[PDB]
């Protein structure tokens, strides 16, 4: 599996996940810096204050 890994509004990039990984994630929240989006491999738990999407196809987390 490859997923997108760039932050926020930066130009899209990608990485290959570790073997066995079937998830990509995108995670959006606000803090003192502004709005942050983090993208990568896997899928963390749902947390208050964070909008999370996890998807299972190449480059889906754009």
UniProtKB/Swiss-Prot annotation:
InterPro entries recorded: Snake_3FTx, Snake_toxin-like_sf, Snake_toxin_con_site, Toxin_cobra-type
Major localization class: secreted
GO cellular component terms attached to this protein's record: extracellular region
Expression by tissue: Expressed by the venom gland.
An example molecular function term from Gene Ontology annotations: ion channel regulator activity
Disulfide bond annotation, renumbered to this chain: 3-24, 17-41, 43-54, 55-60
Keywords (A to Z) from UniProt: Acetylcholine receptor inhibiting toxin, Disulfide bond, Ion channel impairing toxin, Neurotoxin, Postsynaptic neurotoxin, Secreted, Toxin
Cellular localization per UniProt: Secreted
Role noted for this protein: Binds with high affinity to muscular nicotinic acetylcholine receptors (nAChRs) (tested on Torpedo marmorata AChR, Kd=0.07 nM) and with low affinity to neuronal alpha-7/CHRNA7 nAChRs (tested on chimeric receptor, Kd=3 uM) and inhibit acetylcholine from binding to the receptor, thereby impairing neuromuscular transmission. Produces peripheral paralysis by blocking neuromuscular transmission at the postsynaptic site.
Family that this chain belongs to: Belongs to the three-finger toxin family. Short-chain subfamily. Type I alpha-neurotoxin sub-subfamily.
Name of the protein in question: Short neurotoxin 1
Species of provenance: Naja pallida
Taxonomic lineage from the root: Eukaryota, Metazoa, Chordata, Craniata, Vertebrata
């Amino acid at each position: 599996l490859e997923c997108h890994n760039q932050q926020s509004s930066q130009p899209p990039t990608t990485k290959t996940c570790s073997p066995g990984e079937t998830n990509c994630y995108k995670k959006v929240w606000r803090d003192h810096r502004g709005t942050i989006i983090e993208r990568g491999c896997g899928c963390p738990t749902v947390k208050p204050g964070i909008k999370l999407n996890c998807c299972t196809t190449d480059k889906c987390n754009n």
